[PDB]
Amino acid sequence: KLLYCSFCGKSQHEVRKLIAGPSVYICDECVDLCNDIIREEI
């Protein structure tokens, strides 16, 4: 039942949303991080 974000290791119970990939996951928190990285801004 436990699913984990592949980037930070948090479970679905720890984040607001966990997005599925083939055999991976990424949570809303890491997405925020990806946006800063792509947009090169804080």
Residues at the site binding a second copy, with contacts judged by CB under 8 A: 6-9, 16-17, 19, 21-24, 26, 28, 30-31, 34-35, 37-38
Does 8 appear as a known binding residue?
yes
Contact criterion met (CB below 8 Å) for 10 and 21: no
The one-letter amino acid code at 28 reads D
**Structure tokens belonging to residue 31:** 């997405």
Determine the Cα–Cα distance for residues 37 and 11; give it in Å rounded to an integer: 23
With CB under 5 to 8 Å by kind, the binding choice for 21 among Zn ion, a second copy, none is a second copy
Cβ distance to a second copy smaller for residue 13 or 23: 23
Binding residues for Zn(2+): 5, 8, 27, 30
